[PDB]
């Protein structure tokens, strides 16, 4: 519309703004003052129609976002780069007989040692710039400015948790879709059939069986067997919310919950699995709209002409931009009746959060300091534990 | 030389690696793991053929590498730039010619002189950046990483010291070859002749001799003479190592009256005293492999297009590059039969090492710390003392 209001014309006069004094190397020095009227507009009180509108409160809403897999996180010393692991293969006890060659007492019997070698993690970073002169214009107390400087920092702590939780639930779906053997994969037909298969596959763990681990794709576990058991204190179902609302809605969940394990807290579920994307073709960055889209989510370091390798992850919705279409797929389970039952010790996850406040660079030209947050996180998944995937594929 | 071994194909996959995690803005963020098999490889053992091999031991050999010139170092203040020295040139007496007119008394005969204006030295610089992200992917003990961070720092001072002796050596040799008189040079013919011409070049430095110095290269001394002696507690002989070895094993060990005439207390010696290069013709930098060759010796700041002035000094073997041939000549004697017998206190050498360890710059974007080392070193040779060169 259009407004011929005496106060709205004063409001919309942008040549008087504070931004004019900070986007020009020479600017206005002394203030004459302004006539402020609250008549026949908003901000109008019944008494004293000539005062400036005043703030009752300003409220920093700071939500503590949590990583649900944080109790799995071991902490290492960030030294070397290859973590390896190994088991001892089964040798079943044999009957003894007193009528043998009796120089087989001299014979040897070594253990057999299935292993697997893991690479490194990656170091991740994020920064935030806080200045000292222009952000003071909009808090009216020192306490609100310090709460702002602290809320920015705790948001930078919280989105690390969001990143790591979304990253690990992308790992556990990428694993089961692509890398997992089709011996651990059971196939369902309908939702009640899948519920009965999930509830019999929980009970297919806690059993001394060499059938449910992928020790055959360890380095030395191709011949022989390796028997794994799993308690119920370390079994986790990873599924969707539309299917957790059906698994918990059965009488078997009630008899698990009564006098026993908390079955609500062993079923880790999400809305539908995957907001994380993968790169399949090594592309480059060509357009400014994609650069600004990456700047919106805090990715400051990437510029035009940067190449993205095959297998890089993004952790937000990227596939709508012109040069990402086709080059980028999604870690999303096919035929969303989906449940992946694992032992929680299979997630080999360790970090290094020792010294993640690197000391600030001041930049006293603009008086805008910058704090960086560096952390090393190693995400892997071990083959020596019971895993079952129940899909319709 | 083609290998189809599966562990060698696992090692040959450069897509899985620490490098493409640290080259790109985005990378893979989890590891599924790889089947490592030690069978039919260099890493194979008998009982367990499936583990990754182990280091127990990681050494860091270190050496301190002293200077052999820093008794000559005068700790200056590093203020002002132009230093000067002078002598008063010799005026011989003349005969009393009484037939000249008597107003010869009123004419003034000012004492003439010979100066030499030196100038500034060179502020010299080196730095080293230690990483906190990818250096820690090596060094399986934290003690080894701290030993590394210290050994780099202690190597920087070692190749300050060897650089300063290379520059003192090259200063003396380049001053022997390009500046001198016709009087100062001698021509030896062999190793047995030079070891006696050195002995008879001493006993010539300590005569009242208007020759043997280079005041004709001083500012006011182009016409006139200047006499100087030495004291034999001030004479330095700069030879190669073959000549000092020859003296000590042959000439001393084949004489009986060695109790008086041993001059090897005054002899510094070098194994090969040409390795340092100069510039002629004033080129510039245009080739990529040349600056990649320069980066290996620590010179980080040179880009392409940078020009090199007509008197710069390179201090390592540099004449093989594509740009530098014809422009760069080596400071060396052409015969390996060499002796420069000069006076000490003809070699001024003032370095300044006070504000030297400058405070570091933590670079937390890349999580790294750069340390700098700065020193100001002035080195020069005075033209007012006795010098004799013996070469071919």
């Amino acid at each position: 519309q259009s407004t011929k209001n005496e106060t709205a014309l004063l409001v919309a006069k942008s040549a008087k703004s504070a931004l004019q004094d900070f986007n020009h190397d020479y600017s206005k020095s002394w203030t004459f003052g302004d006539k402020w009227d609250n008549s026949n507009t908003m901000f109008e009180t019944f008494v004293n129609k000539y005062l400036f509108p005043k703030i009752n409160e300003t409220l920093l809403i700071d939500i503590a976002l949590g990583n649900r897999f944080n109790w799995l996180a071991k902490e290492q010393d960030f030294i070397g780069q290859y973590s390896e692991e190994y088991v001892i293969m089964d040798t079943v006890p044999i009957n003894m007989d007193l009528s043998k060659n009796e120089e087989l007492m001299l014979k040897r019997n070594y253990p057999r040692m299935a292993t697997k070698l893991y690479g490194n993690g990656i170091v991740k970073k994020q920064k935030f710039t806080l200045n000292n002169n222009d952000t003071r214009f909009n808090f009216q107390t020192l306490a609100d400015a310090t709460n702002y400087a602290l809320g920015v920092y705790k948001k930078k702590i919280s989105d690390i948790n969001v990143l790591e939780e979304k990253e690990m639930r992308a790992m556990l779906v990428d694993y089961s879709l692509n890398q997992l053997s089709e011996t651990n994969v059971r196939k369902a037909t309908s939702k009640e059939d899948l519920a009965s298969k999930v509830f019999e596959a929980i009970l297919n763990l806690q059993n001394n069986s060499a059938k449910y681990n992928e020790v055959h794709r360890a380095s030395g576990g191709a011949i022989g067997q390796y028997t794994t058991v799993s308690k119920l204190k370390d079994i986790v179902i990873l599924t969707t919310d539309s299917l957790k609302s059906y698994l918990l809605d059965t009488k078997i969940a009630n008899t698990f919950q009564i006098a026993g394990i908390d079955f609500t807290d062993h079923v880790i579920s999400f809305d539908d699995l995957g907001g994380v994307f993968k790169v399949t073709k090594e592309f480059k960055l060509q357009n400014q709209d994609s650069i600004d889209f990456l700047r919106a989510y805090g990715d400051y370091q990437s510029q035009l002409g940067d190449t993205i390798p095959v297998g890089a992850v993004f952790t937000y919705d990227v596939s709508k931009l012109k040069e990402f279409t086709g080059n980028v797929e999604e870690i999303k389970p096919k035929s969303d009746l989906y449940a992946f039952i694992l032992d929680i010790n299979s997630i080999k996850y360790k970090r290094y959060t020792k010294g993640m406040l690197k000391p600030p660079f001041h930049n006293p030209e603009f008086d805008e300091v910058t704090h960086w947050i560096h952390y090393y996180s190693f995400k892997a998944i071990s083959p020596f534990f019971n895993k079952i995937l129940i899909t319709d594929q | 030389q083609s290998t189809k071994n599966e562990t060698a194909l696992l090692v040959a996959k450069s897509a899985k690696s620490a490098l493409q995690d640290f080259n790109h803005d985005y990378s893979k963020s989890w590891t599924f793991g790889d089947k490592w098999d030690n069978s039919n490889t260099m890493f194979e053992t008998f009982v367990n053929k499936y583990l990754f091999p182990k280091i127990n031991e990681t050494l860091l050999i270190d050496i301190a590498l002293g200077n052999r010139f820093n008794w000559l170092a005068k700790e200056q203040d590093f203020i002002g730039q132009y230093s000067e020295e002078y002598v008063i040139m010799d005026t011989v007496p003349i005969n009393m010619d009484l037939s000249k007119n008597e107003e010869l008394m009123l004419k003034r005969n000012y004492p003439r002189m010979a100066t030499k204006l030196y100038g500034n030295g060179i502020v010299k610089k080196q730095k080293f950046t230690l990483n906190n992200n990818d250096t820690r992917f090596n060094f399986q003990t934290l003690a080894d990483a701290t030993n590394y961070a210290l050994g780099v720092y202690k190597k920087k001072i070692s190749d300050i010291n060897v650089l300063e002796e290379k520059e003192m050596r090259a200063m003396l040799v380049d001053y022997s070859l390009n500046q001198l008189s016709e009087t100062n040079v001698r021509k030896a013919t062999s190793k047995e002749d030079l070891a006696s011409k050195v002995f008879e070049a001493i006993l010539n430095l300590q005569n009242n001799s208007a020759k043997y110095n280079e005041v004709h290269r001083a500012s006011g001394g182009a016409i006139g003479q200047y006499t100087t002696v030495s004291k034999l507690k001030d004479i330095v002989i700069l030879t190669t190592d073959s000549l000092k070895s020859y003296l000590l094993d042959t000439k001393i060990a084949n004489t009986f009256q060695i109790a008086g005439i041993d001059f090897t207390d005054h002899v510094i010696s070098f194994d090969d005293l040409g390795g340092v290069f100069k510039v002629t013709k004033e080129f510039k930098l245009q080739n990529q492999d040349s600056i990649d060759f320069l980066r290996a010796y620590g010179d980080y700041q040179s880009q392409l297009g940078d020009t090199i002035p007509v008197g710069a000094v390179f201090t390592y073997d540099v004449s093989k590059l594509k740009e530098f041939t014809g422009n760069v000549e080596e400071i060396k004697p052409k015969s390996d039969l060499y002796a420069f017998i000069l006076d000490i206190n003809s070699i001024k050498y003032k370095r300044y090492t006070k504000g030297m360890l400058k405070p570091p710059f933590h670079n937390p974007e890349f999580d790294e710390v750069t340390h700098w080392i700065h020193y100001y070193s002035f080195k020069a040779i005075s033209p007012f003392f006795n010098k004799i060169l013996i070469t071919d």
């Binding site: 702590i157 690390i160 959060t353 010294g355 | 906190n132 701290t146 961070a149 210290l150 720092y153 710390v369």
Partner: peptide, 27 residues
């Protein structure tokens, strides 16, 4: 093992690792 002047400026203390104080929020 060999110290000399081991605890030098910021990097020689940065490998002698520093201040596990802030960890991630859940546990």
């Amino acid at each position: 093992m060999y110290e000399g002047n081991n605890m030098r400026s910021m990097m020689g203390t940065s490998y002698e690792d520093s201040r596990l104080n802030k960890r991630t929020e859940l546990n």
